[PDB]
């Protein structure tokens, strides 16, 4: 049962997202400190976002998947506010939590297994048919667009 200590993600963020367009995505990169080879690659590149109940079957555990032109990244069983440690999109090993701020945000945190200090945030929100993925690098402020399909 899901009402017994752990998170329930809300049905608005279960589904299939592909990227579609996005805001000062570039300026972000470059705040990150991708040079303009890699900033070209990263912000042209097709996304497709897929949040689901696991597959294993397990109540309150979740499988992601971000599915891109060339890297893929597939996150099974995992719960809302447990860490785990993964591979990410840069092909490195990441400690990785996605969480709740309140039922309409949720949050996806990562952290350099090589490089601890590199902690970052990325937040999802439901607005309409689209689902929002906002980030903040040193000031500089980024919005994606996913269309639900
Ligand atoms: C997240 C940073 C990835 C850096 C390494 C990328 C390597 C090869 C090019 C792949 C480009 C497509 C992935 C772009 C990142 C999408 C981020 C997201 O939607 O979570």
Redesign the pocket.
């Known amino acids: 049962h899901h009402h017994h200590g752990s998170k329930t993600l809300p049905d608005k963020f279960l589904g299939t997202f592909k990227?579609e367009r996005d805001e000062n995505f570039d300026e972000y990169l470059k705040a990150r400190g991708?040079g303009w080879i890699?900033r070209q690659?990263?912000?042209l590149?097709?996304?497709t976002?897929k949040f689901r109940n696991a597959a294993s079957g397990k109540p309150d555990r979740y499988d992601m998947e971000?599915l891109?032109?060339?890297?893929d990244t597939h996150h099974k069983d995992w719960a809302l506010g447990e860490e785990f440690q993964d591979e990410?999109?840069?092909?490195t090993q990441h400690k990785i939590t996605f969480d709740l701020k309140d039922p309409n945000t949720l949050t996806e945190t990562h952290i350099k297994v090589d490089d601890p200090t590199d902690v970052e945030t990325?937040e999802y929100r439901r607005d309409g048919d689209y689902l929002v993925?906002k980030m903040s690098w040193k000031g500089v402020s980024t919005s994606?667009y996913?269309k639900k399909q």
Do not use: E, H, Q
């Not at 891109?68 to 890297?71: A, N």
């Open positions: 990227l991708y890699m690659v990263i912000k590149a097709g996304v976002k971000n891109t032109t060339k890297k990410a999109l840069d092909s990325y993925m994606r996913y």
